[PDB]
Design a protein around this ligand. Structure first.
Ligand SMILES: [Zn+2]
Lengths: 50, 159, 347, 126, 58, 49, 66, 48, 31
RNA sequence: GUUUUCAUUAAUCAGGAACGUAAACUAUU
RNA sequence: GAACCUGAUUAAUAGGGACAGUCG
C-alpha cells in the first residue's frame, strides 16, 4: 500500500538522519562534559588560519 | 434496469451470478439483484478501484451482508478496492454519499476548517473502534468521493 | 538584587499596531527587522536606535513571518504571499524585487545557514523550499495526507538540511532536505506555538507550547522530553535559544519574558513592565548578552540577560569580585536566607 | 432569551478578547456567524476557525481585536449615508470595519465601496 | 537558619555534600592561582558573533 | 554553616516517599486520661501478653 | 397522545380534589395543568388535527372517562 | 502636532482598554519629541 | 468613561441598540 | 436514566385570575 | 420570535409527554 511504502521509505530517511546526528553526538558529549567552554568558537573565526 | 453492458459490467455481473452456486451456502441479496451499474476510474497512480451502484432498498439489503462478500470481491476479482454505493441524482445527497461510502465504520464529526484566507478544508473523522483495516482504504475513499462529487475531503482517524 | 536593572531601551518610536514578527541577521550583529500588525516592516540598526533605517508598507494583513537572507536582503510572509526586499541600497526602494503567491497561505520563514535556500511554512500542511536565483515555485514537501496548518518552521543551523516544524495537530514533524520527504511526526497533548533548535547541540530542540510549557526534545529519540521548563501563566508565544546554546528566552502570552538555563527547569529571571502589553517574539542578539522583545504594544524593547551584570571592559579587581560573588552563590545559594532573597522577584 | 445568535457569538468573542483566552466554543452555530468571522479573518482580527458538528465553532483568535458588536434594528444605509455611518460607528476611519448585508453578500465597508453596492448595517468590529 | 533544610539536587548523601564543600573559596584562605582557578566561570563568553558551530570539533 | 538539618531532611524524604516498654507506655498513658485508640490496641496487646 | 395524557392527569387531579376538597396545592397544580392543556389544545387547533368546535371544560373529561 | 514621550508613556501605562487611543497617538505622520528627564510626568515635561 | 464606545446608541454586551430617532438623525445630517 | 414520542408548539408581561402586633444597626467569571 | 434551501430537513447545547428506580 502507499501508506506502508511511504512508512518504510521514511523509516529509511529517519535512519539516515540519525546517522548524520550521531556524527555530532561526540562533540555534544565533550561540550557537556568539559570544565570550561570558550565562546565564540575558534572554528567560526573569519581569520581562522591567518 | 438502466444498462446495456460495458466491458467490465458483464464481468462484475457474472461475479454476482457466480456467487450463487459453486460456493457458499450464503445468498440473500444475490438472487434478487440484476445488472445494476459499475464504474472504473483510477485512484492514485497505478491502482484503480471498482465502484458498483445499488438500488436504494438494496443498500440496507447489502448492509445485511458485507463481511467476506467484499473480501471475495477483492480477491476473486482483479485485486483492487471494491466499493458499493447507492445510485442517486443536494447537501443531504452528498452526506448520504459519505455515510454509504464508509460501510463498516460510522463517521462521527465533520470539521470544516478554514485557513487564514478564504480557503477552507473539510475533514470528516471516523470511529476509533475500527482503525487497522481502513487506513489503507482512506485515500481511496477520499479519491472516489472527489471523483463522484467534486468536493475534496480528507479522511482521518481522531487522535 | 539591588543592581538588577534589566531594561535597557526601546528601538525607535516603535510600530503603530503590535509587533507580530521580528528577525535578526545571523551574520551581522546590529541588523534587526520587525513587521507589525498593520503590515509595515522596519529594518533597525542596533547602533543607532533613535530612528529606523528602512521602513515599507509591506502587506495588507499582519506580517506573520520574516527573515534575512544570507546576502543582505530580507523576506517577509503574509496572507498575501511572501516578498523580498533590498533594505540596504544606495537609493531606498519601497518596491519588492520578488514576490510569491502560489502555495497557499504562508505562515513562517526560515533561511538556510550557508546557501541561498529558504523554507516557508504554508497553511496547506506543506512546507516549500526555494533556492534563490535558480528556483521559481520551489519544491513542496509535505506529510502525505496532512491538512492542518504548519505554524512554524526552523532550519537547524548546526546540522544543515534538517528542518523542524510544528503543526496545529498538536504535532511536531521533521524533514530531511537531502532526501526530500518528511521523517517523523509526534503528536503531543497540547498545540505547540514554536519550534527552535540548539545552536551548539545539533540534535536538541525546544517547542514552546500552549501547555504553558517548554519541552526540550532529542531529535533522535522522541520518546521522552529531555527537559520540561514550566514557569508560565498564559501560553508561551516564542522561545529562542541563546547563541551559546545554554540559555533560553520565552515570551509568553501574558506580560512576561522568562529567562532560563538549559538544565534548570524553572525560571532564572522574569521580566515584565506595565507598558508592555503582550509578548509575541523574543530573540537574543548575537552577543548572547542582550535580548529583544517584540510586543503587542508596537514596541521592540531591548533588555539584557544577566540583569545585574554590566557590560564593557572591567578592571581585574572588578571582574574578580563579580566572579567571586558568582562562585560563592553557586556554593551557598541553597541556604534559607540566601535562597529567599535570590528568589524574590516582583511579579 | 436572545434570538440573536450572532449577538451571543459576538458576546463570547468579546469575553475571550477581554479575558485573554486563545480560543472559544461558540455553541450555537449559524451561517451569518460564519460570514461574519470570514470578514474578520479577511481583515486578520481572528486567526483560524472550524465548524465542528454534534454544531459549534472553534475560533482561534490572535489577540488583535478590541470589540465586536451587532446593530440590533439593522438599519438600511446608502453610500452617502455609509460615510457618515462609518465615521459615527468607528473610533477612526482607518481602524475597524462596519459589516453590511448587501445584495452582493456580507462584506466590509471598503469592499462595499469597491463593489458600489449599499445595504443594511448588521455589525461592526474594531 | 544557617543549617540547610535539605540536600541539594545532585548530591546523594549528607557526608558527600557536607564534606564536598569543605574549603573556602576566598582569597584570604587560598593562594592567588587557586583563587583564580576556582572562580573561573564555566562558560567564558567573549564579545563577537557567536555563530552556531560549523563542523564537529571532536 | 551549610550542614544538614537532619530532622528537616528526614521529614522532606518522608513527605516525598509517601514487652518491657509497652508497660511503661500504659503507665504513662493511664494518667491523661484520654482513651486514644492506640491505647486500646496496646491494652489488647497487654491482655495477649 | 400528549393531550390525552394531560387530560388524564387533569381528571385524576380533579377526582382527588373532589374527594378531599380542603387542600390548595392540588388546586394550584390543577390551574397549571389546565393552562397547559389549553395551550397545547390551541396549538393543535391551529394545526387542525382535532375538531375546532371540540372543547374541554369538564363535560369532555366526563365523556372521555365515560 | 507633536507628542512627547511622557505623553506616549502615560498612554502606554494606562491599560489595554486604551489601545485605540494608543494607536491613534502612534500614527506615523506626527513629530515625536524625545525627552531627556527621569520621571515621565507629562505635566512637568510639558511645562518645562 | 470608556474611549472605544461609539457615539450613536447605547451598548449592552455585544448588542448595540439604536433608537429610531438616531438613524433618522444621521440621515438628516447626510442631507 | 432510557434502546421514548408531535416538531414550534416557545420567551415576556397591558387587562384579569389562584393562593396570604410589626419594625429597630445593616455569555462567562 | 431558532438554524437548514444553485408528497414528511437538522432532531435544538428551548420545548411538553411516556416509562423505570427513586427523592423530599
Ligand atoms: Zn519628557
Amino acid at each position: 500500500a502507499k501508506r506502508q511504502q511511504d512508512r518504510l521509505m521514511r523509516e529509511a530517511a529517519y535512519k539516515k538522519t540519525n546517522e548524520t546526528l550521531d556524527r555530532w553526538i561526540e562533540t555534544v558529549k565533550h561540550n557537556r562534559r568539559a570544565e570550561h567552554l570558550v565562546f565564540p568558537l575558534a572554528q567560526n573565526a573569519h581569520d581562522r588560519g591567518l | 434496469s438502466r444498462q446495456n453492458p460495458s466491458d467490465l459490467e458483464r464481468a462484475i455481473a457474472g461475479a454476482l451470478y457466480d456467487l450463487e452456486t459453486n460456493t457458499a451456502d450464503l445468498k440473500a441479496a444475490l438472487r434478487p439483484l440484476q445488472f445494476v451499474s459499475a464504474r472504473e476510474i483510477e485512484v492514485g497512480h497505478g491502482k484503480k478501484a471498482i465502484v458498483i451502484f445499488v438500488p436504494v432498498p438494496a443498500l440496507q439489503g447489502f448492509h445485511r451482508v458485507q463481511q467476506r462478500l467484499t473480501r471475495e470481491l477483492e480477491k476473486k476479482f482483479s485485486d483492487r478496492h471494491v466499493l458499493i454505493l447507492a445510485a442517486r441524482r443536494l447537501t443531504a445527497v452528498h452526506d448520504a454519499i459519505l455515510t454509504d461510502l464508509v460501510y463498516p465504520v460510522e463517521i462521527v464529526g465533520k470539521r470544516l476548517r478554514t485557513k487564514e484566507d478564504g480557503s477552507k478544508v473539510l475533514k470528516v473523522i471516523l470511529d476509533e473502534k475500527e482503525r487497522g483495516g481502513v487506513d489503507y482504504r482512506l485515500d481511496t475513499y477520499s479519491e472516489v468521493y472527489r471523483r463522484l462529487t467534486g468536493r475534496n475531503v480528507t479522511f482521518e482517524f481522531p487522535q | 538584587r539591588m543592581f538588577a536593572k534589566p531594561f535597557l531601551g526601546q528601538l525607535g518610536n516603535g510600530h503603530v499596531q503590535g509587533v507580530y514578527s521580528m528577525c535578526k541577521d545571523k551574520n551581522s550583529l546590529n541588523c534587526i527587522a520587525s513587521g507589525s500588525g498593520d503590515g509595515v516592516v522596519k529594518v533597525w540598526d542596533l547602533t543607532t536606535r533613535d530612528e529606523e533605517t528602512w521602513r515599507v508598507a509591506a502587506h495588507n494583513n499582519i506580517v506573520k513571518g520574516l527573515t534575512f537572507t544570507n546576502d543582505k536582503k530580507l523576506l517577509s510572509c503574509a496572507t498575501d504571499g511572501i516578498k523580498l526586499w533590498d533594505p540596504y541600497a544606495s537609493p531606498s526602494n519601497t518596491t519588492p524585487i520578488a514576490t510569491w503567491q502560489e502555495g497557499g497561505p504562508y505562515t513562517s520563514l526560515s533561511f538556510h545557514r550557508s546557501a541561498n535556500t529558504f523554507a516557508a511554512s504554508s497553511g496547506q500542511g506543506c512546507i516549500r523550499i526555494w533556492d534563490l536565483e535558480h528556483s521559481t515555485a520551489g519544491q513542496a514537501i509535505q506529510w502525505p495526507s496532512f491538512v492542518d496548518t504548519i505554524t512554524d518552521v526552523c532550519f537547524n543551523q548546526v546540522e544543515t538540511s534538517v528542518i523542524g516544524s510544528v503543526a496545529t495537530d498538536r504535532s511536531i514533524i521533521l524533514f530531511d532536505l537531502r532526501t526530500n520527504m518528511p521523517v517523523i511526526k509526534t503528536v503531543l497533548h497540547f498545540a505547540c506555538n514554536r519550534i527552535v533548535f540548539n545552536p551548539m547541540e545539533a540534535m536538541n530542540l525546544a517547542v514552546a507550547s500552549e501547555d504553558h510549557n517548554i519541552y526540550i526534545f532529542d531529535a533522535r529519540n522522541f520518546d521522552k522530553a529531555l527537559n520540561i521548563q514550566k514557569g508560565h501563566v498564559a501560553a508561551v508565544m516564542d522561545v529562542e535559544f541563546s547563541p551559546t546554546g545554554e540559555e533560553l528566552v520565552s515570551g509568553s502570552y501574558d506580560r512576561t519574558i522568562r529567562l532560563w538555563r538549559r538544565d534548570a527547569g524553572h525560571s532564572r529571571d522574569v521580566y515584565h513592565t506595565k507598558r508592555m502589553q503582550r509578548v509575541f517574539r523574543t530573540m537574543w542578539t548575537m552577543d548572547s548578552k542582550y535580548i529583544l522583545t517584540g510586543s503587542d504594544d508596537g514596541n521592540v524593547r531591548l533588555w539584557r540577560a544577566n540583569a545585574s551584570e554590566r557590560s564593557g571592559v572591567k578592571a581585574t579587581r572588578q571582574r574578580q569580585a563579580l566572579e567571586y560573588n558568582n562562585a560563592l552563590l553557586d556554593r551557598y545559594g541553597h541556604l534559607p536566607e540566601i535562597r529567599r532573597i535570590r528568589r524574590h522577584r516582583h511579579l | 432569551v436572545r434570538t440573536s445568535v450572532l449577538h451571543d457569538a459576538l458576546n463570547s468573542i468579546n469575553n475571550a478578547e477581554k479575558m485573554g483566552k486563545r480560543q472559544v466554543m461558540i455553541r450555537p452555530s449559524s451561517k451569518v456567524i460564519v460570514k461574519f468571522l470570514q470578514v474578520m479573518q479577511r481583515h486578520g482580527y481572528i486567526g483560524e476557525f472550524e465548524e465542528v458538528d454534534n454544531g459549534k465553532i472553534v475560533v482561534q483568535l490572535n489577540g488583535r481585536l478590541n470589540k465586536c458588536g451587532v446593530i440590533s434594528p439593522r438599519y438600511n444605509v446608502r453610500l452617502a449615508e455609509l460615510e457618515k455611518w462609518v465615521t459615527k460607528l468607528l473610533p477612526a476611519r482607518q481602524f475597524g470595519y462596519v459589516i453590511l448585508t448587501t445584495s452582493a453578500g456580507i462584506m466590509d465597508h471598503e469592499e462595499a465601496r469597491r463593489k458600489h453596492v449599499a445595504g443594511k448595517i448588521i455589525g461592526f468590529f474594531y | 537558619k544557617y543549617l540547610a533544610t535539605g540536600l541539594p539536587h545532585p548530591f546523594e548523601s549528607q557526608q558527600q555534600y557536607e564534606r564536598s564543600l569543605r574549603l573556602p573559596v576566598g582569597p584570604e584562605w587560598m593562594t592567588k592561582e587557586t583563587f583564580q582557578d576556582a572562580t573561573k566561570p564555566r562558560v567564558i563568553i567573549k564579545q563577537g558573533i557567536i555563530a552556531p558551530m560549523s563542523k564537529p570539533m571532536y | 554553616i551549610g550542614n544538614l538539618d537532619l530532622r528537616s531532611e528526614k521529614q522532606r524524604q518522608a513527605e516525598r516517599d509517601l514487652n518491657t516498654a509497652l508497660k511503661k507506655y500504659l503507665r504513662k498513658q493511664r494518667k491523661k486520661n484520654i482513651i486514644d485508640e492506640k491505647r486500646l490496641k496496646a491494652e489488647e496487646l497487654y491482655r495477649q501478653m | 397522545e400528549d393531550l390525552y395524557f394531560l387530560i388524564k392527569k387533569a381528571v385524576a387531579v380533579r377526582k382527588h380534589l373532589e374527594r378531599n376538597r380542603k387542600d390548595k396545592d392540588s388546586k394550584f397544580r390543577l390551574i397549571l395543568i389546565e393552562s397547559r392543556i389549553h395551550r397545547l389544545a390551541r396549538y393543535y387547533k391551529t394545526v387542525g388535527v382535532l375538531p375546532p368546535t371540540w372543547k374541554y371544560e369538564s363535560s369532555t373529561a366526563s365523556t372521555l372517562v365515560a | 502636532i507633536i507628542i512627547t514621550s511622557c505623553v506616549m508613556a502615560e498612554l502606554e501605562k494606562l491599560g489595554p482598554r486604551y489601545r485605540v487611543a494608543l494607536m491613534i497617538a502612534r500614527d506615523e505622520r506626527w513629530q515625536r519629541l524625545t525627552c531627556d528627564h527621569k520621571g515621565t510626568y507629562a505635566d512637568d515635561c510639558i511645562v518645562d | 468613561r470608556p474611549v472605544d464606545l461609539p457615539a450613536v446608541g447605547r451598548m449592552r454586551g455585544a448588542e448595540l441598540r439604536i433608537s429610531a430617532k438616531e438613524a433618522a438623525a444621521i440621515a438628516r445630517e447626510v442631507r
